[PDB]
Every structure is written in C-alpha cells, then in structure tokens.
C-alpha cells in the first residue's frame, strides 16, 4: 500500500485516455522554439496528458472558488477571482527542471480556463556573488542559505494573496550572478510555475510550498545526473566558457579528459552533496514525481492518490 | 493584502449564507453531550456553516478523483474510490481542540457524500512514560520529541494510501499513559480528523500536514487559555485526580487556593513554553484559524483564499 498511483512509461503509453489530445502545428513550432533537445514524442505522449491532469486540478480549484463565494453570498472581503494556482518544480541541478517547467508552461496556457501562465525560477532569489563571498557561501551556491529566503517567501505570498503586482529579481546564467536592476513582474496570472532546487524545502514556520497547489519533482538515478552534468560542462566550453570575459574562460581550453575531471570535481564537491542533503529528502513532498532514464526519457510517474 | 479572508463575528453573523440546512433536535441532544465550551449559538452560527464550507472542499476532491480516474480510463493501479480526506486540528493545550473536533465530526457526518467520519488524537502517539523517563522528557510531554513521529507519520501515510485498515495506539488521560495492547482501528473513512498540538509542526522531510486536505488552528489570547487551563486543573481534583491509583492523586487534596498556584506553575513551566516555542508558529500554516474570546465564543475567522 503506497501513497502513489504508479505507472512505468509502457503502462502510461498504453493507457486508453478519455481525450482528444493532439498538438497543433502552431504549438510544434512554439515547442521547438524553447530548445530542441526536447523530444517531441516526450511532449506528446507524456507532458500533454500530464498537462491535462494538472488542468483538471486547476479547473476544480476555480469551481471550488465559485461555489465557496456563492455559499458565502459574495461578501465584500472575499476576492472576486481565484488567486493564482501555484505549481512547484523541484529536483537536482542538471535534471531538466527548467525544460519541464517551460514545456508545462506552454501546454497549460492552451486551455481557455487558464490562458495566463507565468514562470519564475528561484535562481533570481540567490544572493548576488559579492554577498555570497561576504557570507563564506560561494562554494554553496544553490544550498538553502545561498538564497534570500525572506524575499522568496514575500514574493510567493504576494502572488498567493492575489496582488496585481509582484516582483522578482533576475539571475544571469551567462554571468553567474544576479543582474543588478533587473526585475520580473508578475500580475495575477492564472497559474504561476515556480522552478528551483529549493522549492519543496521545509522551514520552522509557513514555507513557500505551503502556498503550492501542485508540485513536481524531476528525479533520476544519481549516476545518470552526474553524466548529464559532465556533458553539460563539456558542452559549455563552446558556449558560456568561450567568452574571454567569463571567470571560467580557462575551462574552454580543457581537453575532454581534464574537462571530465574538472566537471566531476565540481559535481562531487557542490551539486551532489546539495542533492543528497537538501534536495532528495524533499522528493516525497511532491504531488507528482517524474523519473527519467539515462537517455532523458521519462520511465516512471508517481502521482499522489486523490 | 493577505493570504487569507478575514471575518470578525459580527461580519460572519451578517453574511447572507446559502441555505440553513438546519439541525434536528435529536442531533442537538447528542451535541450537548460533547461540548460546554461550544454553546448552541456557536454550533448554529459558526460550526454548522464551517462544516458546509468544509463539505464543499470534500465534495470537490471526490469529484476531482472521479474526473481523474475517467481521464486515465480507470486503470488497474488507480484506486476504486477517493482516499480519506484528512483534517488537522491544532492549538494550545486547553484551547478546546477536542471539542471542536468532536463537533466537526458530528456535523460533517450529516452529508450522504461522506457519512463515515473518524476522529484520532495524536495523544496515542506519545511515547509511553517509561520511554519519556529514559529520554529526559517527563517534563516535556506534548513537546515535538515526546511523540513517536515516525509511527505517527506511518499511520497517516497508511490512511492516505487507501488502506482498508490502519491502527493507532491509545492514550489514557486517567492513567496518564499509553494503554498497553490497546488500539484504535480506522477503516478507510470518508474523512479523518486528526486532532493534536503537534499536527501542523514542520520537519526536515515529509511531515503529517503534507498529508492534510484541510487544517484548523484554534486560537485564543495566551492569558485566556491560562484561565481555562486553571479551571480545568481545579475540576480534575474531583475526577481524574480522585483515584488513589492516579500518578496525580496528591493534587486531589489541594485547596482551591493552592490548586490555582500549582496549575499556573505547571502552565508557566510546561504548557505555555510549548505554546510559544512550538505550537504558535504553526498557526499561519492552517487553512482556517478560529480565534476565541475569554468565554469561548469565536470572535474571528481567517480562511485561506481559494
Ligand atoms: C552553470 N555552470 C555549470 O554547469 C558548470 O560550471 C561551473 C563552474 C564553476 C562553478 C563553481 C565555481 C566555484 C565555486 C566556488 N567557490 C562554486 C561553483 C560552478 C558551480 N555551480 C554551482 C551551482 N550553481 C547554481 C545553483 C543554483 C542556481 C544557479 N546556480 C551554479 C554554479 C559551475
Ligand atoms: C493530566 N493532567 C492535566 O491535564 C493537569 O495536571 C497536570 C499535573 C502535572 C503535570 C506534570 C507534572 C510533572 C511533570 C514533570 N516532570 C510534567 C507534567 C501535568 C503536565 N501535562 C503537560 C501536558 N501533557 C500532555 C500533553 C499532550 C498530550 C497529553 N498530555 C499532560 C501533562 C499536568
């Protein structure tokens, strides 16, 4: 007896679902536009149905809002509309959270019940590099205390409170730092997706996940994520590290053997221990856990029983 | 701009709430035999409408279950029925959690949608006195570590897994201990109410409130609860303290004057610190906070925006 309904990929594919679910050509162009590594078969067979499932929870919450408001005789202090529906997306560095989040964002927006779907990464809530240096935390970027938790909690509370205006800072992956001045404005979307390492982490009191209506954890074997991380580092020699401005420009000239050593050392000393200590223990808190094969294909889905 | 909608008693009274769905006199009879800190008026004006509000959420979750099962084409690995809807009830010792829980049990059971409503206290998950002594915890009964959290978590997981059978140990207040070999059986009820000081407490990983569909915190001024605690202690001289076998039999003989001194000392040294450190910070985690005045009448309701 488990708290989850479990499917492997084969079972999932074989399901006789009650839809009518197919992507539009307009959508296939859009979905290429947000990467390319993303397998379109993945999107059609797994993420599209997953989106419909989530859509059922969003519509249910919107109708509960209406039934409750009617029951209360719409008092003045009740909001006139449902507050945004907030989805957490958690998992290891390099597991593909950002891709999953971006795919879900594009698929969920296609229902007229909730056409406005925003995406915020908690990367924008990291303390900037100097502030991290000050705190002896440069080697722990992505650990819980490397983020401004108070600011993160204020932002999510503002959105959940039904504010028409809420503001998040922005992180540059190119520069490895917060862009001073930069802001992302959120204006009462129907759905907000909140993607990050730390979204399902707990705290002594009200925590950001107390405000989630749904959450995903993107999972994979630790050895496989290590390989993805190493490949990403090697591929970065051409992109992020190629700029003579980069603080990591020296890595561009590392040949495959030395690059694998540098990548694995960084994995072993920062990202892997952050996963073991801080991220993995949050995995059972997710509404939906998606596990990936070594080839990046989803091999298993666990959904909390309703 | 807040995550909750707030009503004081006068506004709650003023509301044009849909349909009385009023109470039979034979039900009101049963309602007397479980309250005293819940008056007839409180049932009529507060608790009954609250039960309707909660019923709306239970019904929504039942229908979401069915929509979801149908979308998936009711596969083998999906349960045939929704798992139990679990309601947490938290607050200070002597705030009236047990009475609130018993009233909600009686009211929520009045719908055909969910006639089977179980009630479990976390007192059953206290370590037995022998284990508490071993652990230097005799002065800390009700504090987070005084409970076998692992066993509590296992019980709630078993219930949310849709088990046909889940067992909780039993705590005797009269004997001030777990009853050996005693168990409460819970058999897939439609709704389980889990009542306890500690039900909204946080932890490093999966916590019991992760498994809740709705939660209530019973609130009051710290000085008002102290007075209720004192009255309670004084009353126990005639009842639980009367038995020469009681661990607290020596308190039976205290005059009113001296009993007040003892009660306030116990409040000051155990229960109040527990409230300040461990119980009060969980208050913002509740879906619904009910605040009571000095004579036990609700003066304020704060409900999470839907
Ligand atoms: C995005 N970059 C890579 O994947 C591979 O490149 C590096 C290179 C250096 C470092 C690094 C160097 C020195 C220290 C020290 N002291 C620490 C790291 C990191 C490390 N990453 C850790 C995870 N970081 C996070 C974590 C959460 C959100 C955004 N970024 C990105 C930097 C990644
Ligand atoms: C069962 N008794 C009462 O409610 C009121 O009287 C007393 C008397 C003594 C004590 C007491 C005496 C000595 C130590 C030591 N060392 C500790 C307590 C307590 C203390 N209560 C704290 C809260 N306890 C809880 C807390 C949660 C669930 C069930 N019981 C009941 C005992 C309550």
XYZ file of C-alpha atoms and ligand atoms in Angstrom:
678
model
C 0.000 0.000 0.000
C 1.642 3.186 -1.327
C 0.505 6.856 -1.320
C 1.077 6.884 -5.093
C -0.544 5.653 -8.207
C 2.476 4.425 -10.163
C 2.955 3.961 -13.945
C 6.011 2.983 -15.906
C 6.409 4.567 -19.389
C 4.922 1.496 -21.188
C 1.831 1.468 -18.990
C 1.473 5.222 -19.430
C 1.663 4.965 -23.270
C -0.854 2.116 -23.330
C -3.497 3.948 -21.284
C -6.816 4.426 -23.039
C -7.399 8.057 -22.167
C -10.753 9.860 -22.487
C -9.382 12.634 -24.772
C -8.834 14.033 -27.831
C -5.294 15.315 -27.075
C -3.101 16.391 -30.008
C -0.642 19.255 -30.510
C -1.307 21.991 -33.064
C 1.288 22.821 -35.762
C 1.435 26.311 -34.215
C 2.386 24.551 -30.932
C 5.038 22.299 -32.545
C 6.709 25.477 -33.862
C 6.443 27.105 -30.410
C 7.815 23.997 -28.648
C 10.810 23.779 -30.939
C 11.297 27.471 -30.103
C 12.040 26.681 -26.447
C 15.045 24.384 -27.030
C 15.384 21.439 -29.445
C 16.929 18.722 -27.252
C 13.347 18.219 -26.023
C 11.947 15.128 -27.693
C 8.566 15.967 -29.289
C 7.457 12.385 -28.626
C 8.033 13.086 -24.904
C 5.870 16.186 -25.179
C 3.017 14.431 -26.976
C 2.995 11.120 -25.060
C 3.889 12.313 -21.548
C 3.726 16.078 -20.981
C 0.487 16.721 -22.893
C -1.525 14.175 -20.798
C 0.273 15.399 -17.687
C -0.886 18.892 -18.526
C -4.489 17.670 -18.877
C -4.241 16.024 -15.493
C -2.979 19.269 -13.932
C -5.701 21.164 -15.832
C -8.293 19.039 -14.001
C -6.885 20.161 -10.655
C -6.846 23.864 -11.760
C -10.456 23.805 -13.040
C -11.530 22.017 -9.816
C -9.941 24.776 -7.713
C -11.578 27.506 -9.842
C -15.028 25.884 -9.429
C -14.440 25.448 -5.687
C -13.678 29.176 -5.524
C -17.034 29.932 -7.206
C -19.069 27.505 -5.039
C -17.469 28.919 -1.861
C -18.066 32.583 -2.876
C -21.714 31.756 -3.662
C -22.111 29.936 -0.357
C -20.724 32.970 1.470
C -23.072 35.264 -0.527
C -20.030 37.003 -2.049
C -19.011 39.162 0.890
C -17.004 42.310 0.157
C -13.717 40.974 1.586
C -13.715 37.762 -0.487
C -11.677 38.242 -3.714
C -13.755 38.424 -6.928
C -11.498 35.860 -8.667
C -9.465 32.751 -7.661
C -5.912 33.521 -6.566
C -3.184 32.218 -8.865
C -2.729 28.412 -8.839
C 0.927 27.824 -7.968
C 2.969 24.834 -9.187
C 6.374 23.938 -7.715
C 9.024 22.258 -9.864
C 11.924 20.689 -7.913
C 14.922 18.382 -8.471
C 18.739 18.148 -8.857
C 20.878 20.635 -10.757
C 21.048 19.410 -14.418
C 17.972 17.122 -14.202
C 15.981 19.264 -16.701
C 13.668 21.159 -14.321
C 13.801 24.275 -16.447
C 12.831 22.404 -19.619
C 9.970 20.592 -17.861
C 8.757 23.878 -16.417
C 8.928 25.595 -19.806
C 7.066 22.747 -21.547
C 4.335 22.704 -18.882
C 4.004 26.462 -19.139
C 3.343 26.317 -22.908
C 0.905 23.363 -22.622
C -1.139 24.734 -19.684
C -1.663 28.093 -21.370
C -3.611 26.377 -24.191
C -6.779 25.986 -22.050
C -9.106 28.996 -22.001
C -9.824 28.298 -18.302
C -6.262 29.452 -17.595
C -4.538 31.098 -20.593
C -2.121 33.191 -18.467
C 0.707 31.016 -17.168
C 3.869 32.640 -15.665
C 7.235 31.008 -14.910
C 9.702 32.160 -12.230
C 12.939 30.411 -11.294
C 14.135 30.755 -7.723
C 17.627 31.308 -9.253
C 16.633 35.018 -9.127
C 16.468 34.767 -5.326
C 20.119 33.770 -4.863
C 22.101 36.432 -3.013
C 24.423 38.110 -5.522
C 28.065 36.863 -5.725
C 29.610 39.575 -3.532
C 27.037 38.940 -0.836
C 27.748 35.211 -1.161
C 31.520 35.962 -0.830
C 30.790 38.009 2.318
C 28.962 35.059 3.872
C 31.595 32.381 3.047
C 28.946 30.843 0.729
C 30.409 30.963 -2.813
C 31.082 27.204 -2.637
C 27.449 26.583 -1.599
C 25.569 28.356 -4.347
C 22.227 26.519 -4.554
C 22.271 25.375 -0.917
C 19.283 26.650 1.186
C 21.113 29.615 2.855
C 22.508 30.779 -0.511
C 19.045 32.176 -1.319
C 17.270 35.171 0.192
C 14.508 33.094 1.814
C 12.678 36.093 3.284
C 12.477 37.756 -0.148
C 11.409 34.470 -1.818
C 8.679 33.956 0.785
C 7.439 37.589 0.411
C 7.169 37.222 -3.369
C 5.209 33.955 -3.293
C 2.935 35.323 -0.509
C 2.181 38.446 -2.540
C 1.210 36.307 -5.567
C -0.884 33.938 -3.391
C -2.588 36.890 -1.723
C -3.977 37.939 -5.098
C -1.795 41.040 -5.624
C -1.964 42.538 -9.088
C 1.738 43.285 -8.842
C 4.647 41.131 -7.594
C 8.311 41.425 -8.437
C 11.249 39.007 -8.608
C 14.933 39.737 -9.282
C 16.670 38.086 -12.254
C 19.710 35.786 -12.413
C 22.120 35.612 -15.370
C 23.410 32.103 -16.088
C 25.945 33.594 -18.525
C 27.429 35.840 -15.864
C 26.857 33.509 -12.889
C 25.141 36.302 -10.979
C 22.075 38.433 -10.380
C 21.600 41.210 -12.945
C 21.552 44.426 -10.854
C 18.418 46.459 -11.585
C 16.598 43.654 -13.474
C 13.110 42.619 -12.406
C 10.395 40.200 -13.483
C 6.902 41.471 -12.871
C 4.078 39.001 -12.205
C 0.481 40.292 -12.456
C -2.064 37.802 -11.040
C -1.573 35.046 -13.653
C -3.996 32.080 -13.654
C -1.059 29.780 -12.953
C 2.420 30.511 -11.674
C 5.098 27.855 -12.054
C 7.922 28.215 -9.523
C 11.013 26.274 -10.633
C 14.106 25.733 -8.450
C 16.321 23.424 -6.348
C 14.782 24.637 -3.117
C 11.031 24.897 -3.801
C 9.975 21.876 -1.690
C 12.381 22.513 1.201
C 10.840 22.949 4.633
C 11.327 25.587 7.351
C 10.235 26.160 11.001
C 7.050 28.068 10.045
C 4.998 28.922 6.900
C 7.216 27.830 3.967
C 6.931 28.599 0.230
C 5.447 25.133 -0.548
C 2.615 25.798 1.932
C 1.362 28.039 -0.856
C 1.614 25.454 -3.671
C -1.480 23.891 -5.119
C 0.538 21.236 -7.008
C 4.209 20.209 -7.242
C 6.536 18.096 -9.395
C 9.845 16.514 -8.554
C 12.032 15.606 -11.592
C 14.038 12.557 -10.471
C 16.768 10.327 -11.935
C 19.483 7.982 -10.721
C 22.344 9.957 -9.182
C 24.934 8.363 -11.549
C 22.880 9.429 -14.572
C 22.544 13.045 -13.398
C 26.347 13.104 -12.883
C 26.777 12.116 -16.575
C 24.342 14.808 -17.750
C 26.199 17.358 -15.617
C 29.584 16.340 -17.100
C 28.222 16.541 -20.698
C 26.734 19.952 -19.983
C 30.115 21.194 -18.652
C 31.972 19.818 -21.692
C 29.389 21.433 -23.989
C 29.852 24.734 -22.112
C 33.475 25.004 -23.363
C 31.880 26.193 -26.667
C 29.275 28.456 -25.160
C 29.424 30.021 -21.713
C 33.184 29.413 -21.211
C 34.142 30.599 -24.734
C 33.761 34.269 -23.745
C 37.152 35.813 -22.718
C 35.120 37.844 -20.154
C 33.989 34.720 -18.260
C 35.557 33.979 -14.860
C 35.643 30.408 -16.169
C 37.168 31.074 -19.578
C 40.147 28.853 -18.641
C 37.860 25.779 -18.911
C 37.216 26.340 -22.649
C 40.708 25.055 -23.467
C 40.460 21.941 -21.195
C 40.620 18.781 -23.353
C 37.996 16.050 -22.810
C 39.925 14.193 -20.071
C 40.740 17.245 -17.966
C 37.261 18.716 -18.552
C 35.709 15.493 -17.201
C 37.923 15.799 -14.133
C 37.033 19.487 -13.535
C 33.286 18.809 -14.063
C 33.226 15.784 -11.770
C 35.121 17.601 -9.028
C 32.565 20.429 -9.099
C 29.737 17.875 -9.128
C 31.288 15.924 -6.178
C 32.013 18.962 -4.011
C 28.900 21.141 -4.578
C 25.930 19.796 -6.573
C 25.960 16.142 -5.473
C 26.114 16.917 -1.704
C 23.407 19.566 -2.154
C 21.249 16.874 -3.843
C 21.851 14.214 -1.150
C 21.441 16.521 1.866
C 18.863 19.119 0.770
C 17.026 18.202 -2.445
C 16.423 14.437 -2.459
C 14.807 14.425 1.011
C 12.088 16.730 -0.436
C 11.161 14.285 -3.211
C 8.358 12.565 -1.226
C 6.692 16.002 -0.684
C 5.838 16.361 -4.386
C 2.328 15.691 -5.756
C 3.958 14.192 -8.862
C 7.382 12.570 -9.190
C 8.695 12.008 -12.748
C 11.750 9.793 -13.042
C 13.994 9.922 -16.117
C 16.096 7.253 -17.823
C 19.768 7.846 -18.670
C 18.599 8.866 -22.180
C 16.438 11.646 -20.684
C 13.162 9.786 -21.350
C 10.557 9.555 -18.591
C 10.461 5.924 -17.358
C 8.133 6.309 -14.371
C 5.364 8.552 -12.995
C 4.116 8.677 -9.411
C 1.016 10.640 -8.650
C -0.400 11.172 -5.162
C -3.737 9.350 -4.928
C -6.708 11.711 -4.920
C -3.076 42.174 1.061
C -3.062 38.825 2.866
C -3.180 35.111 2.002
C -6.477 34.834 3.924
C -10.010 36.252 4.048
C -10.877 37.649 7.492
C -14.273 37.902 9.211
C -14.962 39.015 12.730
C -18.023 37.575 14.476
C -20.377 40.469 13.576
C -19.484 40.205 9.843
C -19.716 36.418 9.950
C -23.139 36.881 11.503
C -24.192 39.437 8.877
C -23.412 37.117 5.916
C -26.216 36.000 3.607
C -25.141 32.337 3.692
C -26.830 29.897 1.305
C -29.486 27.634 2.898
C -29.741 26.845 6.638
C -29.689 23.015 6.158
C -30.750 23.271 9.815
C -30.456 20.862 12.748
C -32.807 18.253 14.196
C -33.457 18.243 17.957
C -32.267 14.637 18.353
C -28.938 15.732 16.837
C -28.804 18.783 19.187
C -29.211 16.329 22.108
C -26.060 14.430 21.080
C -24.441 17.845 20.544
C -24.832 18.771 24.231
C -23.018 15.640 25.410
C -19.674 16.658 23.880
C -19.311 20.462 24.218
C -19.752 23.045 27.028
C -17.011 25.227 25.510
C -19.252 25.070 22.433
C -22.665 26.647 23.108
C -25.843 26.129 20.994
C -25.312 29.547 19.382
C -21.750 28.640 18.372
C -22.960 25.478 16.645
C -25.713 27.325 14.817
C -23.780 30.424 13.751
C -20.211 29.196 13.372
C -19.639 25.442 13.298
C -22.524 24.393 11.064
C -21.632 26.944 8.340
C -17.953 25.888 8.729
C -18.959 22.240 8.194
C -20.729 23.353 4.989
C -17.621 25.201 3.832
C -15.513 22.104 4.506
C -18.111 19.847 2.844
C -17.585 21.927 -0.334
C -13.878 21.045 -0.344
C -14.540 17.327 0.359
C -17.113 17.185 -2.448
C -14.669 18.980 -4.810
C -11.950 16.435 -4.020
C -14.387 13.484 -4.537
C -15.367 14.839 -7.979
C -11.713 15.537 -8.896
C -10.985 11.926 -8.047
C -13.692 10.747 -10.495
C -12.716 13.159 -13.292
C -9.123 11.971 -12.935
C -9.978 8.270 -12.848
C -12.061 8.693 -16.001
C -9.343 10.652 -17.839
C -6.873 7.847 -17.109
C -9.529 5.341 -18.267
C -9.730 3.795 -14.752
C -6.543 1.698 -14.934
C -5.858 -1.194 -12.565
C -3.255 0.687 -10.487
C -5.675 3.524 -9.661
C -7.886 3.084 -6.507
C -11.652 2.489 -6.974
C -12.548 5.308 -4.533
C -11.021 8.567 -3.229
C -8.662 8.070 -0.316
C -9.799 9.577 3.023
C -9.891 13.423 3.279
C -7.775 14.304 6.347
C -8.460 17.359 8.504
C -5.896 18.569 11.043
C -6.900 20.313 14.258
C -4.109 22.134 16.164
C -3.777 24.642 19.042
C -2.692 25.013 22.681
C -3.417 22.535 25.446
C -6.871 23.509 26.882
C -7.887 25.699 23.878
C -10.719 23.234 23.083
C -9.321 21.269 20.166
C -11.021 18.031 21.226
C -14.485 19.613 21.482
C -14.048 21.444 18.136
C -13.017 18.145 16.530
C -15.982 16.241 18.033
C -18.438 18.864 16.825
C -16.977 18.856 13.305
C -17.104 15.026 13.318
C -20.812 15.120 14.189
C -21.687 17.824 11.660
C -19.603 16.621 8.701
C -21.116 13.147 9.037
C -24.541 14.614 8.131
C -23.854 14.548 4.351
C -24.531 11.387 2.285
C -21.332 12.206 0.347
C -19.234 11.474 3.439
C -21.202 9.757 6.281
C -18.139 7.983 7.768
C -16.010 10.468 9.766
C -13.284 9.209 12.080
C -11.502 11.094 14.875
C -7.944 10.352 16.032
C -5.942 12.234 18.635
C -2.112 12.405 18.429
C -2.036 11.634 22.214
C -1.958 7.990 21.161
C 1.439 8.619 19.578
C 3.087 9.883 22.764
C 5.993 7.749 23.902
C 4.891 5.746 26.986
C 6.002 7.232 30.339
C 8.862 4.686 30.673
C 10.339 5.806 27.358
C 9.848 9.506 28.255
C 11.802 8.981 31.537
C 14.593 7.198 29.636
C 14.823 10.261 27.366
C 14.805 13.082 29.992
C 11.389 14.059 28.605
C 8.915 13.696 31.518
C 8.685 17.491 31.864
C 8.151 17.838 28.106
C 5.053 15.758 27.396
C 3.380 17.391 24.361
C 6.628 18.806 23.021
C 7.595 17.673 19.486
C 10.067 14.922 20.596
C 7.622 13.455 23.136
C 5.805 11.764 20.252
C 6.931 8.833 18.166
C 6.837 10.933 14.958
C 7.863 8.007 12.770
C 4.882 5.931 13.980
C 2.536 8.917 13.597
C 3.770 9.543 10.036
C 3.348 5.816 9.225
C -0.240 5.870 10.461
C -1.251 8.918 8.420
C 0.546 7.545 5.317
C -1.325 4.253 5.745
C -4.681 6.147 5.882
C -3.806 8.311 2.798
C -2.582 5.198 0.965
C -6.189 3.964 0.962
C -5.504 1.028 3.309
C -8.661 -0.734 4.446
C -7.066 -0.991 7.883
C -4.883 1.378 9.962
C -4.068 1.228 13.684
C -3.254 3.899 16.231
C -2.261 3.285 19.881
C -4.451 4.648 22.669
C -3.604 7.174 25.362
C -5.414 7.226 28.685
C -5.655 10.612 30.404
C -6.877 8.991 33.646
C -3.759 6.772 33.818
C -1.552 9.433 32.221
C -0.057 6.924 29.763
C -0.476 4.737 26.687
C -2.714 1.740 27.404
C -0.697 -1.418 26.630
C -2.175 -3.592 23.844
C -4.943 -1.048 23.149
C -5.562 0.096 19.567
C -7.997 2.254 17.565
C -8.840 0.775 14.149
C -9.565 3.148 11.269
C -11.146 1.647 8.163
C -10.956 3.899 5.149
C -13.333 6.589 6.479
C -14.523 9.295 4.101
C -12.954 11.922 6.368
C -10.398 11.524 9.125
C -9.971 14.285 11.689
C -6.519 14.276 13.299
C -6.512 16.334 16.460
C -3.328 17.395 18.273
C -0.971 20.128 19.488
C 1.644 18.966 17.005
C -0.283 18.290 13.764
C 0.918 21.483 11.966
C 4.542 21.091 13.072
C 7.249 21.087 10.454
C 10.128 18.647 9.864
C 13.185 18.126 7.605
C 11.278 15.871 5.194
C 7.715 14.509 4.720
C 5.523 15.693 7.627
C 1.969 14.717 8.657
C 0.457 18.022 7.457
C 1.746 17.244 3.915
C -0.986 14.607 4.005
C -3.798 17.021 5.061
C -6.522 18.311 2.794
C -7.620 20.966 5.286
C -6.487 22.239 8.669
C -7.864 24.177 11.561
C -5.957 26.074 14.266
C -7.974 27.014 17.403
C -6.592 30.323 18.646
C -7.017 32.473 21.765
C -5.153 35.049 23.905
C -2.418 33.358 25.938
C -3.875 34.765 29.227
C -7.380 33.499 28.342
C -6.105 29.976 27.718
C -4.192 30.142 31.031
C -7.505 30.788 32.851
C -9.172 27.833 31.029
C -6.218 25.636 31.948
C -6.564 26.599 35.656
C -10.335 25.864 35.680
C -9.647 22.530 34.028
C -6.942 21.568 36.602
C -9.228 22.505 39.528
C -12.043 20.343 38.050
C -9.693 17.319 37.756
C -9.465 17.041 41.563
C -12.995 15.549 41.645
C -12.397 13.387 38.559
C -9.056 12.008 37.264
C -7.126 13.013 40.416
C -9.703 11.309 42.742
C -8.464 7.754 42.108
C -5.781 6.789 44.707
C -4.057 4.989 41.830
C -3.551 8.168 39.742
C 0.004 9.450 39.341
C -1.507 12.830 40.281
C -3.661 11.733 43.221
C -1.744 14.060 45.585
C -3.322 17.062 43.773
C -6.843 15.943 44.775
C -6.329 17.373 48.316
C -5.098 20.846 47.257
C -7.487 23.600 48.341
C -8.801 25.843 45.521
C -6.244 28.492 46.513
C -3.306 26.025 46.366
C -4.599 24.277 43.236
C -4.539 27.624 41.381
C -0.875 28.025 42.435
C 0.023 24.544 41.167
C -1.964 24.896 37.928
C -0.340 28.216 36.982
C 3.094 26.837 37.816
C 2.548 23.854 35.536
C 1.178 26.222 32.873
C 4.201 28.593 33.211
C 6.813 25.810 33.120
C 5.458 23.318 30.543
C 2.347 24.250 28.542
C 2.907 27.967 27.889
C 6.532 27.496 26.756
C 5.291 24.711 24.481
C 2.660 27.059 23.039
C 5.209 29.921 22.452
C 8.036 27.789 21.007
C 6.295 25.009 19.074
C 2.532 25.456 18.590
C 2.008 29.170 17.908
C 4.448 29.366 14.956
C 2.359 26.715 13.126
C -0.707 28.954 13.232
C -0.117 30.598 9.796
C 0.067 27.054 8.267
C -3.649 26.435 8.932
C -6.271 26.650 6.163
C -8.603 28.069 8.784
C -7.780 29.960 12.011
C -10.587 30.383 14.592
C -9.986 32.909 17.383
C -11.961 32.675 20.606
C -12.652 35.228 23.298
C -12.436 34.658 27.085
C -15.864 32.998 27.218
C -15.093 30.613 24.349
C -17.064 32.402 21.627
C -15.394 32.759 18.240
C -14.544 36.418 17.558
C -12.537 35.915 14.337
C -12.154 33.575 11.361
C -9.308 33.633 8.837
C -9.671 31.380 5.837
C -7.091 30.777 3.088
C -8.095 32.413 -0.169
C -9.237 29.829 -2.748
C 26.305 26.654 -14.757
N 27.654 26.071 -14.743
C 27.953 24.785 -14.875
O 27.080 23.953 -15.011
C 29.394 24.349 -14.835
O 30.193 25.457 -14.444
C 30.525 25.796 -13.154
C 31.779 26.367 -12.940
C 32.146 26.753 -11.648
C 31.289 26.587 -10.548
C 31.723 26.987 -9.271
C 32.984 27.532 -9.110
C 33.448 27.943 -7.861
C 32.678 27.835 -6.729
C 33.138 28.248 -5.599
N 33.528 28.658 -4.583
C 31.407 27.305 -6.862
C 30.942 26.883 -8.116
C 30.027 26.022 -10.769
C 29.106 25.815 -9.575
N 27.671 25.926 -9.791
C 27.020 25.518 -8.527
C 25.507 25.588 -8.718
N 25.197 26.997 -9.071
C 23.819 27.325 -9.093
C 22.931 26.768 -8.167
C 21.591 27.126 -8.187
C 21.155 28.058 -9.125
C 22.074 28.588 -10.041
N 23.368 28.234 -9.996
C 25.847 27.394 -10.339
C 27.346 27.343 -10.094
C 29.658 25.622 -12.069
C -3.026 15.125 33.009
N -3.032 16.375 33.769
C -3.522 17.593 33.484
O -4.101 17.891 32.454
C -3.346 18.680 34.518
O -2.421 18.332 35.556
C -1.067 18.129 35.397
C -0.325 17.799 36.528
C 1.042 17.573 36.407
C 1.697 17.668 35.170
C 3.073 17.423 35.134
C 3.754 17.101 36.293
C 5.120 16.845 36.269
C 5.856 16.911 35.110
C 7.110 16.636 35.110
N 8.235 16.345 35.064
C 5.188 17.209 33.946
C 3.812 17.455 33.968
C 0.958 17.999 34.032
C 1.672 18.131 32.691
N 0.876 17.979 31.491
C 1.664 18.513 30.346
C 0.867 18.293 29.052
N 0.579 16.842 28.963
C 0.042 16.362 27.735
C 0.388 16.935 26.509
C -0.131 16.439 25.320
C -0.996 15.359 25.368
C -1.293 14.773 26.606
N -0.776 15.269 27.746
C -0.295 16.479 30.087
C 0.612 16.547 31.298
C -0.415 18.236 34.154
